Amino acid sequence: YQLEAVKGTSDPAMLADTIAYHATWTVAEKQEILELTDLEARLKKVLGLLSRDLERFELDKRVAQRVKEQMD
């Protein structure tokens, strides 16, 4: 539902700053995103923080599979 109001919608600053509050991570990094006025760097900062959290949780499920094979 948040994607329906941003897909096919203009103003990419709207699209960045609306979703940069909704997802929950470090609040100071959200404020630093607010400090970053470059829009393409804002989108790439959201993508890079997403990549950091994604590799964190891929390492989570990898170590979880280690724990699963370890309990087997």
Partner: protein, 75 residues
Amino acid sequence: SDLEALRKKIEEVGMPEAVKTKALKELDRLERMQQGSPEATVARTYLDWLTEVPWSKADPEVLDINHTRQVLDED
């Protein structure tokens, strides 16, 4: 709170290389999905023990006998 402040008081808060290594190894030991292991809880304590340990904050020292005399004369 402490999960974000202790993440960033490792590498900008100046700290020796014998201690920066364990600060980074507890940066890697913690921040693991809010790790709930008992070693991670005592490491949550320990990283707070190991960041406010005072380093890169020396205050100016004197290697002359003459200034050594009069400050203890004032003491």
